[PDB]
Design a binder for this molecule. Sequence first.
Ligand SMILES: CSc1scc2c1-c1nc(SCC(=O)C(C)(C)C)ncc1CC2
Length: 148
Amino acid sequence: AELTPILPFLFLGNEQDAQDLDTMQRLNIGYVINVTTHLPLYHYEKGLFNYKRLPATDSNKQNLRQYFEEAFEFIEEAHQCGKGLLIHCQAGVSRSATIVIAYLMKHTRMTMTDAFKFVKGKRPIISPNLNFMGQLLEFEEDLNNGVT
Ligand SMILES: CSc1scc2c1-c1nc(SCC(=O)C(C)(C)C)ncc1CC2
């Protein structure tokens, strides 16, 4: 049950990783982003975590760029209060890895490929999907022609 730490307060996992409550609390995670339409918000009724759903499919037509800003705000909310945030989807982590990489590109000032190489080093099994990759490329330009 690996919850891959990407930053000290930002973790990435699949559907089975998000179900390990005892590891969540050990790592002081109080925020969860569920990047699926169909999975439950694990541990919702327990009243322990703040939740956000990005209702996205792992398809070639899914727009994830629309969710970047909303997701970055939830990450910084956890960061500013000293709590960890878990972002997960399913096996292959295609959706959640895209959002994690996008965050690193904006607030770590890495390039698209540098962020991808950084994440792959920590979670070696990332399933590819060219549609999300193209959205990250467009995202890189919007960054390079803006502030921070
Ligand atoms: C931003 S990805 C990137 S940049 C340069 C390369 C790649 C890459 N990525 C992947 S898997 C990750 C993905 O496709 C996501 C679902 C997170 C968008 N497989 C192969 C390659 C080839 C080289």
